[PDB]
Structure 1
Amino acid sequence: RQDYIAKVRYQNDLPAPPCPPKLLKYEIEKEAPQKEFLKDS
């Protein structure tokens, strides 16, 4: 079958990991400062 030459290849390649910048937990995200803050007089 001498016709137009064309290749079909579906692209489902997984991308590289993004490695985004990491958030910093607040002081109120730790249990001991929470205990200090809630027990305030």
Structure 2
Amino acid sequence: RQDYIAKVRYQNDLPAPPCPPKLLKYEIEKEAPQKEFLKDS
């Protein structure tokens, strides 16, 4: 079958990991400062 030459290849390649910048937990995200803050007089 001498016709137009064309190749079909579906692209489902997984991308590289993004490695985004990491958030910093607040002081109120730790249990001991929470205990200090809630027990305030």
Q: TM-score range by the shorter chain?
A: over 0.9
TM-score by length of 2: 1.00
1:27 CA drift (Å): 0.0
Provide the residue aligned with 1:39 in structure 2: 39
Q: How does 1:2-41 map to 2 (within 5 A)?
A: 2-41=2-41
Q: Which whole-Å deviations, capped at 9, do the CAs of 1:1-41 have from their partners, x for residues lacking one?
A: 00000000000000000000000000000000000000000
Q: How many residues align?
A: 41
Identity fraction in percent: 100
CA RMSD of aligned residues (A): 0.0
How many angstroms apart in 1 are the aligned matches of 2:35 and 2:2? Answer: 79
Gaps of 5+ in 2: none
